Ligand binder design. Structure first.
Ligand SMILES: [Mg+2]
Ligand SMILES: [Zn+2]
Ligand SMILES: [Zn+2]
Lengths: 49, 75, 1327, 347
RNA sequence: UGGGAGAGGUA
DNA sequence: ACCACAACGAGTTACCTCTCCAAGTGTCAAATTTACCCAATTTTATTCAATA
DNA sequence: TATTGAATAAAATTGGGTAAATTTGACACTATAATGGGTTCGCTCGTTGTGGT
């Protein structure tokens, strides 16, 4: 219902297709926050396990 | 089961596991292309799943052995 | 998509170039002739990406045929414009510059890394003083900061043997030349020689920083920036305004300043500029980079043209309007509406009125899905124009979609969890939402202009969560206490009160009716009144010993209205709950009793029926308010004139000079308060019982049917204080400095006030109206602090398997029982059995959930102390067990594993902030010659044990207060034996004999002066400050001897019977007099919401209370100072422990008697850190629970104790290491108590010694900031400090908390996501 | 031009005027703010300055202020209050002389009124002379006490001296608790003008004063007879004694018709005089938005009943008849402006 | 496009 | 060691409503791309025949 | 009768480099005397970090 750009279009087409199921992903505001902490000279990164 | 969910809750034991089992059953009834075990009486699949849990035909192990049985039929 | 943890570290220059996509060189943002960004600028499309989707800049490859090519005319890669907000850049700074976070975020960590002062480091960075880096001679050791004079004469002395530099290059050379492991072993060597705790703490801080650097694996020279990264240009857009002009971004301005100064420094460096000019340019580049990273941190903030400081990257990360709190913890949300709310008095408890236009906008893709399922629309555009024209089949499909699809109604501020609830929507006309009247108490809603937000749950899991968890019929009981939140309010209450209330000769009295249906027939036909005292035949039911209902029938004596209410009372309840005049408390008790007897569904149906009949019969009552309803007592003029005569009498008494101003004004206050309560009692009597004119037995008194009195007495709306302001006297008002005025407002609101009385009342009016706003802000901040201190607490076990517990007791503080044991223990789980011979020898089993049945068992077996498993003594790591928590207060049964009890407890504590025979124990007594029991110990208290085995009265007798009765006898009612001296305390003896004034000389320790008030020449002692040279050694010890002169020997010891009497103590008895065992010789004379915030914040009091650290005998170590010294030595071991107590604080327990562990030796409020470290976790939890519940009970709110125990358990997460074992926990450092417990578990498992610890009571803010989740701590507060410490240490968040999984955007490990999270844990642990 | 336009456009005290009704305009113009350039700051101020000082009597109203975070910081001028030459507030008082309460009206500042002893406004008189009692109630040095009839130095000039304008338009204000009187005085400014204005049956007497002094009506400049009344123009032939010898003796009163206000309400003036009627100097010729015959008229008179009705008035809710809707009693006109500007793109 | 300030108001 | 000063941060939640935020033009050394030359490698077709 | 392990041209691809085109940032354009600046305080409460006896 918010900042998941590739998830909310999927949810809209799923509702029109009669399938009440979502496929959530990462928030674009969290990507914005990661880019800003990286721009502050601090290496933050998601860890693939 | 339209107003309250207390009979289904005393059937299962936990509202969170109730939500998960009834969501699995409502997925199978909505997009899985299945048919209910209770008369639907013009209800949504959510309330049909909750009425099935209240009557006592749908449980977690019931759904699991039903999925395993239909898996052995399709294989 | 698939990732476990989130790691943070410093950024190497190669890593900063690795994220980059091209160096930014020119500071131009965009050309303003044509809207095209300039090359190598801040918006350069060759660096960051094309401004159009699959189109180069110059317009050469505009199709998707070239999915990526570098257009050689303009260098632009033809891809999507989504990469503009993802590709970074970099700027290669000519001179290296210091990072402002790792310099001015205190503690600096560069100064802590190098053991250099921050003043010296800023002096180096500001190009003012040189610092040496290496030296071949012994005259210049490392980091010896030199001035310019010392640098020039050392240059003429040595020249090339040393090398001193300046600026950030010198500090980078120092950090690069330092040796990490060598400094580690040197600091671990130097730790042992020092002994002061300050120097030791400095050494542990430096060794923790060095070990954190080595264990993280970063390099210390990466704290000095040589490459600076650039934010992607779609995360700092150039928004165009309506004038054609631009409002350019602060980040674009700060990057422009940094790039301009860096380019000018490059030109001055390759131009061979003078050293002063190039140093000024380097300093300016340092200032610009520091401004861009954090404007307001170092100097004065660079302000824009609008005289406002520029927003930096730190300003975009931190704060309330920063990224975490404004866009990550809370977002704006689609499929959501908002409207003004109205009443829904026809609705049911699960229904809400949703407007048709609101629901048609909220449910539009569901409408498109039903339209394309029914085939009425060919495509999405046809369905869109059909909804745009609003066909009748569109409204029919909306009626089909709405049915059995719940929506969430929410009203801000959502203080507790019942601020969002789910309802089944009813499509209404109009534009306002219709709310059910019985949920407005849980919403804190009224209908004076409140608005609520609607939210549509989309997925099947969300619809099932709204139906099974958040439905309004599913939370009838509160989560804070077990009481129902669905209480009828004021109109239902007025209607049922008017229904059930009787009258003496109404109409159709004395009839005999067949039943409630005949009573309803009589009332609707008009042959009887609602209040006619009548005899009907009530068939009532009763549940048996099994679950079956037995019926019984009788002729009850009742009214007609109670018979009609019996038609809607369900089957299973008695007639005793209907057979009285029902007020608000009686209706709430009836609903709770119906719950406990029948369950949830009959309670919901019963609450609906109660609402319907209360509304209908309040309407049929026709109750009103007139000016003749507020009846003033006719003796108001007489009482007022008597009080005015009293004030005139005391006024002429003051004019006679007999009485002074202070006690005169106090007596005026007492006179007017006596007149106030007298006229209030007269008003209440006249309003309460004036309805007397009756018949059919005689003219007889009854309860008045005045409507103001009915609204007050029913508990509908009003109270006796407001009725007193309406009809009696307004009362004594106060000045804004907290002082009551001499004259009160002698008028009321029926007669009206004059101008002076109204202006007097406006002070308190505006004071209360400012306090409401201030307390909403303070309670909101307190609720946020509590939620963040308790966010990660979730029930993750069923039974931890412990024997620890909390000794529960009925609080009998003051002169009465405050909370009974039944509700103090109801719902808990017993730590062990109860063990007594008692009256029944009841043996409850271990680990039993105490229901109401077991509460009645303990009440009938007369138990007073039960040990129950608490939350602070749970054995579970990372969560609690279900047995240690107990009963789920919202559902009535045991708590399910996976429930966020920390968030429940924090909301339960932070919601009512807007409403904000004789028994002796611990005795050391002496009996004199008369048997007069005067106590000489300090912690002595008395109890009143009953005839059954329960204590019912508590009084702590002060040291020196007098008691007549002993022990063993039965107490007498009204016999207040407790009397005292309320201004002085004695120094009473214990051995009889003739007193000899030994160990003292007249003149230097004792002042010889005959007292002018008694006349007898008595010897007085003097203070130790003004003594002579002969008073600096000995202390005045009243060595009491027997009649012959020698000192007696106390049995059990060998010390002489001498007692050091303190200074400034008048001693009346002289030598040659007789003393008893227990007579004296000297008599020395003597908010709520901020209190809760201080108790949770662990703020030490302004005046502490010194406690005895070690048990033993107390002596003195140093004299001749007001800041004296006390030594307390045990009878077994040695003690070099000395304290420091000033003389302006009094001293409680003298230096002759042996004290115990952790008793008060200086009175005043106790500090909770001292209570913890001297008594225990159980004692500090009992102290905090009692001191918070005192505030919550003084304001009349009922919160359970397990919520405060949850918050204290979250407060006690840290354990400082007092002694190491075999693990790598060195000395004096704070670590998590679960880590110490797990290390001790595995060390005692594999056979090691294990480490010892000492738990620390952190505050709520400090614990929320010192949790081991840096993402949670940074989103709470102090993002600069938390991200700096986490970047230095190289931490990683494992995403175990609800705040972390909300920021990341996953399922929380609580509720329905708990099974998925433990499945993910077993998947990442098995494989 | 840059300095004065920066001030008059975007200062903190250059405020978008509230013009729902005439009361909102007059209260916004009679407003006093403790904030501003060189004043206080809103989040950084406590209960010490948000209190009602005893020197506020007759200068600053205690019951007209917002109830949000601006509560003690935004104030309203009292009715009779003036300023010094230096800018200090002062209020008029009647001077007594040997018990005789004269018509000597003295404007005293807050430092002068603590020296004297000022009698209350609600103390009786006879023949505009002495006081009918011998121990009247007064106030000196901020505190109140009883004083003798020859001890008294001054007396209040009116009984509406303490309150502001909007708190003086509340009838039976002395029976309302000060919290609800504050809320009602604030909510009087939010009233939308209706289709047909209706004078209140229970008013105060400040209605005509507000409706004339607000400048929203069209008062006559000179007295004479009315020559022509349209719905947009009133022509008055001036009487000869009020006529200058060089002019024609004709006054034209053009009226504003359906002008959008700042709050997107309606502003239109309707003529209240008829053809041929005489008017004097100071006579209302055209009504305002929410005036009626020169009297302020913010709402309508509704036949009300105080009873619970089936839960439809549950928690402050209101049940409304159908005659209210059919008779267009609370029907408001809301003019609203939408602009379409054709810009100059580079394509 | 849609950002940031300032002012006011509602619960 | 203990006290007395500086600096940071925090202060309810939404909601709304408004307004306001100078002129190219010719020249030089360096460094930067760019069309291109060429070995190492390796991917793909193509011959021999040899099992099947 | 056939399909395919080994072997081999052989041209395409990778990697490195390299001399010649080509950008790119700067600079010219010039001579009465001038020689050191303008910018926030009516906020509290608490906490933590710094310096003398
Ligand atoms: Mg309200
Ligand atoms: Zn191009
Ligand atoms: Zn436990």
């Amino acid at each position: 219902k918010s900042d998941d750009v590739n998830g909310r279009t999927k949810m809209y087409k799923n509702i029109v297709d009669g399938n009440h199921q979502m496929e959530p992903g990462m928030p674009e505001s969290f990507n914005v926050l990661l880019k800003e902490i990286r721009s502050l000279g601090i290496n933050i990164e998601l860890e693939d396990e | 089961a339209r107003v309250t969910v207390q009979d289904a809750v005393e059937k299962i034991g936990n509202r969170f596991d109730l939500v998960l089992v009834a969501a699995r059953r409502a997925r199978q009834m909505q997009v899985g292309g299945k048919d209910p075990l209770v008369p639907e009486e013009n209800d949504k699949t959510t309330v049909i799943a909750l009425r099935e849990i209240e009557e006592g035909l749908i449980n977690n192990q019931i759904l699991d052995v039903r999925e395993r049985q239909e898996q052995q039929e399709q294989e | 998509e698939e990732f476990d943890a989130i790691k943070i570290a410093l950024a190497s220059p190669d890593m900063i170039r690795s994220w980059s996509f091209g160096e930014v060189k020119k500071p131009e943002t965009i050309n303003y002739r044509t809207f095209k960004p300039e090359r190598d600028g801040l918006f350069c499309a060759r660096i960051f990406g094309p401004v159009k989707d699959y189109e180069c800049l110059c317009g050469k490859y505009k199709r998707l045929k070239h999915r990526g090519v570098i257009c050689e005319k303009c260098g632009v890669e033809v891809t999507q414009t989504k990469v503009r907000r993802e590709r970074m850049g970099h700027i290669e700074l000519a001179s290296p510059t210091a990072h402002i976070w790792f310099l001015k975020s205190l503690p600096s960590r560069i100064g802590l890394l190098l053991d250099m002062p921050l003043r010296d480091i800023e002096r180096v960075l500001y190009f003012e003083s040189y610092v040496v880096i290496e030296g071949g001679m012994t005259n210049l050791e490392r980091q010896q900061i030199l001035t310019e004079e010392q640098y020039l004469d050392a240059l003429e002395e040595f020249g090339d043997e040393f090398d001193a530099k300046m600026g950030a290059e010198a500090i980078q050379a120092l950090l690069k030349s330092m040796d990490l492991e060598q400094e580690c072993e040197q600091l671990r060597e130097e730790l042992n020689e020092t002994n002061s705790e300050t120097k030791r703490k400095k050494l542990t801080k430096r060794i923790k920083l060095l070990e954190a650097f080595v264990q993280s694996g970063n390099k210390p020279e990466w704290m000095i920036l040589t490459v600076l990264p650039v934010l992607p240009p779609d995360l700092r857009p150039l928004v165009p305004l309506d004038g054609g002009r631009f409002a350019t971004s602060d980040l674009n301005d700060l990057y422009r300043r940094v790039i301009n100064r860096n380019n000018r420094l490059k030109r001055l460096l390759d131009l061979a500029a003078p050293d002063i000019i190039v140093r000024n340019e380097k300093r300016m580049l340092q200032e610009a980079v520091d401004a861009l990273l954090d404007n307001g941190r170092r100097g004065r903030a660079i302000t824009g043209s609008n005289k406002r400081p520029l927003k930096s990257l730190a300003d975009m990360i931190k704060g309330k309007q920063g990224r975490f709190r404004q866009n990550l913890l809370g977002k704006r949300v689609d499929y959501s509406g908002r409207s003004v709310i109205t009443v829904g008095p026809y609705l049911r408890l699960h229904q809400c009125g949703l407007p048709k236009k609101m629901a048609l906008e909220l449910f539009k893709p569901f409408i498109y899905g039903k339209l394309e399922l029914r085939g009425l629309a060919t495509t999405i555009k046809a369905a869109k124009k059909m909804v745009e024209r609003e066909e009748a089949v569109v409204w029919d499909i909306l009626d089909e979609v709405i049915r059995e699809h719940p929506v969430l109604l929410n009203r801000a501020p959502t203080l507790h969890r019942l601020g969002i609830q789910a309802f089944e929507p009813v499509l209404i006309e109009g534009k306002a939402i219709q709310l059910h009247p019985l949920v407005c108490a849980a919403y804190n809603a009224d209908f004076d202009g409140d608005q609520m937000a609607v939210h549509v749950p989309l997925t099947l899991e969300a619809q099932l969560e709204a139906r099974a968890l958040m439905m309004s019929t599913n939370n009838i009981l509160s989560p804070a206490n077990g009481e129902p939140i669905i209480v009828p309010s004021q109109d239902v209450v007025l209607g049922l009160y008017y229904m059930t209330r009787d009258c003496v000769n109404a109409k159709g009295e004395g009839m005999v009716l067949t039943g409630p249906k005949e009573a309803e027939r009589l009332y609707r036909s008009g042959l009887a009144s609602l209040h006619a005292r009548v005899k009907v035949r009530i068939t009532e039911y009763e549940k048996d010993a099994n679950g079956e209902l037995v019926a019984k029938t009788s002729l009850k004596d009742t009214t007609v209205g109670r018979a009609i209410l019996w038609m809607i009372v369900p089957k299973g309840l008695p007639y005793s709950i209907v057979n009285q005049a029902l007020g608000k408390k009686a209706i709430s008790k009836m609903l709770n009793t119906c719950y406990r007897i029948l369950g949830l569904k009959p309670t919901v149906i019963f609450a609906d029926q109660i609402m319907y009949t209360g509304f209908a019969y309040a309407a049929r009552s026709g109750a009103s308010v007139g000016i003749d309803d507020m009846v003033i007592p006719e003796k108001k003029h007489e009482i007022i004139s008597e009080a005015e005569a009293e004030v005139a009498e005391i006024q002429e008494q003051f004019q006679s000079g007999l009485v002074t101003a202070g006690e005169r004004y106090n007596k005026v206050i007492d006179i007017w308060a006596a007149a106030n309560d007298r006229v209030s009692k007269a008003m209440m009597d006249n309003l309460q019982t004036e309805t007397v004119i009756n018949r059919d037995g005689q003219e007889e008194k009854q309860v008045s049917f005045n409507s103001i009195y009915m609204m007050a007495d029913s508990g509908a709306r009003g109270s006796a204080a407001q009725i007193r302001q309406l009809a009696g006297m307004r009362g004594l008002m106060a000045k804004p400095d907290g002082s009551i005025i001499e004259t009160p407002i002698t008028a009321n609101f029926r007669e009206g006030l004059n101008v002076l009385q109204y202006f007097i009342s406006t002070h308190g009016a505006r004071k209360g109206l400012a306090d409401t706003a201030l307390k909403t802000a303070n309670s909101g901040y307190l609720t946020r602090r509590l939620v963040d201190v308790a966010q990660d607490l979730v029930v993750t076990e069923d039974d931890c398997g412990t024997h620890e517990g909390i000794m529960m007791t009925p609080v009998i503080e003051g002169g009465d029982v405050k909370e009974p044991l039944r509700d103090r223990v109801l719902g808990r789980v017993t730590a062990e059995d109860v063990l007594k011979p008692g009256t029944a020898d009841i043996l409850v089993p271990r680990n039993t959930l105490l229901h109401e049945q077991w509460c009645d068992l303990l009440e009938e077996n007369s138990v007073d102390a039960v040990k129950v498993r608490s939350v602070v003594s749970c054995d579970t790591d990372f969560g609690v067990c279900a047995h240690c928590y107990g009963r789920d207060l919202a559902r009535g049964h045991i708590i399910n594993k996976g429930e966020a009890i920390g968030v429940i407890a924090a909301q339960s504590i932070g919601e009512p902030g807007t409403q904000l025979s004789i028994k002796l124990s611990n005795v050391k007594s002496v009996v004199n010659s008369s048997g007069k029991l005067v106590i000489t110990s300090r912690n002595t208290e008395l109890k009143l044990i009953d005839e059954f085995g329960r204590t019912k009265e508590s009084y702590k007798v002060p040291y020196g207060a007098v008691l007549a009765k002993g022990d063993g006898e039965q107490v007498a009612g009204g016999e207040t034996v407790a009397n005292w001296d309320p201004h002085t305390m004695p120094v009473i003896t214990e051995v009889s004999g003739f007193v000899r004034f030994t160990d003292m000389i007249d003149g230097q320790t004792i002042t010889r002066q005959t007292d002018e008030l008694t006349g007898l020449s008595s010897l007085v002692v003097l203070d130790s400050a003004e003594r002579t040279a002969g008073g600096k050694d000995l202390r005045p010890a009243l060595k009491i001897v027997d009649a012959q002169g020698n000192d007696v020997l106390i049995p059990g010891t060998d010390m002489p019977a001498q007692y050091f009497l303190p200074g400034k103590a008048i001693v009346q008895l002289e030598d040659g007099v007789q003393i008893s065992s227990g007579d004296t010789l000297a008599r020395i004379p003597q908010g709520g919401l901020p209190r809760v915030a201080d108790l949770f914040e662990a703020r030490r009091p302004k005046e502490p209370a010194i406690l005895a650290e070690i048990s033993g005998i107390v002596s003195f170590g140093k004299e001749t100072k007001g800041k004296r010294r006390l030594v307390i030595t045990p009878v077994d071991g040695s003690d070099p422990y000395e304290e420091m107590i000033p003389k302006w604080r009094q001293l409680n327990v003298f230096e002759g008697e042996r004290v115990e562990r952790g008793d008060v030796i200086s009175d005043g409020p106790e500090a909770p850190h001292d209570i913890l470290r001297l008594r225990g976790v159980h004692a500090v939890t009992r102290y905090i629970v009692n001191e918070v519940q005192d505030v919550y009970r003084l304001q009349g709110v009922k919160i359970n104790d397990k919520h405060i125990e949850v918050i204290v358990r979250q407060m006690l997460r840290k354990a400082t290491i007092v002694n190491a074992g075999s693990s790598d926990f060195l000395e004096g450092e704070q670590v998590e108590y679960s880590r110490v417990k797990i290390a001790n578990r595995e060390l005692e498992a594999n056979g090691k010694v294990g480490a010892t610890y000492s738990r620390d009571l952190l505050g709520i803010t400090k614990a929320s900031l010192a949790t081991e989740s840096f993402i949670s701590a940074a989103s709470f507060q102090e993002t600069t400090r938390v991200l700096t410490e986490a970047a230095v240490a190289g931490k990683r968040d494992e995403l175990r908390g609800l705040k972390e999984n909300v920021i990341v955007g996953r399922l929380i490990p609580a509720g329905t996501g708990y099974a998925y999270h433990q499945d993910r844990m077993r998947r990442r642990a098995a494989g | 031009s840059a300095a004065v336009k920066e001030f008059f456009g975007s200062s903190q005290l250059s405020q978008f005027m509230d013009q729902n009704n005439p009361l909102s305009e007059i209260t916004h113009k009679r407003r006093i703010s403790a904030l501003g350039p060189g004043g206080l700051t809103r989040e950084r101020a406590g209960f010490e300055v948000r209190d009602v000082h005893p020197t506020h009597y007759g200068r600053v109203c205690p019951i007209e202020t917002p109830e949000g975070p601006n509560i003690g910081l935004i104030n309203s001028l009292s009715v009779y209050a003036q300023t010094n030459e230096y800018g200090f507030l002062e209020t008029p008082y009647r001077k007594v002389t040997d018990g005789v309460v004269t018509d000597e009206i003295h404007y005293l500042s807050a430092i002068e009124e603590g020296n004297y002893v000022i009698a209350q406004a609600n103390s009786n008189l006879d023949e505009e002379g002495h006081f009918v009692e011998d121990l009247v109630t007064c106030r000196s040095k901020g505190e109140s006490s009883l004083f003798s009839r020859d001890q008294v130095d001054y007396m209040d000039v009116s009984t509406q001296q303490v309150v502001s304008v909007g708190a003086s338009l509340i009838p039976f204000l002395e029976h309302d608790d000060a919290n609800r009187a504050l809320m009602g005085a604030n909510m009087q400014r939010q009233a939308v003008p209706t289709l047909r204005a209706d004078k209140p049956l229970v008013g105060t007497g400040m209605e005509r004063a507000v409706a004339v002094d607000s400048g929203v009506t069209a008062v006559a400049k000179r007295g004479g007879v009315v020559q022509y009344v349209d719905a947009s123009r009133i022509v008055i032939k001036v009487n000869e004694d009020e006529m200058y010898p060089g002019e024609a003796g004709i006054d034209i009163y053009n009226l504003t018709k359906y002008t959008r206000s700042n709050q997107n309400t309606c502003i239109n003036q309707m003529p209240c005089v008829s053809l041929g009627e005489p008017v004097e100097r100071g006579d209302v010729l055209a009504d305002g938005p929410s005036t009626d015959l020169g009297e302020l008229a913010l709402g309508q008179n509704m036949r009300v009943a105080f009873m619970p009705w089936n839960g439809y008035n549950f928690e402050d809710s209101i049940l409304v008849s159908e005659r209210v809707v059919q008779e267009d009693r609370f029907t408001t006109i809301h003019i609203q402006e939408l602009a379409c500007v054709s810009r100059d793109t580079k394509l």
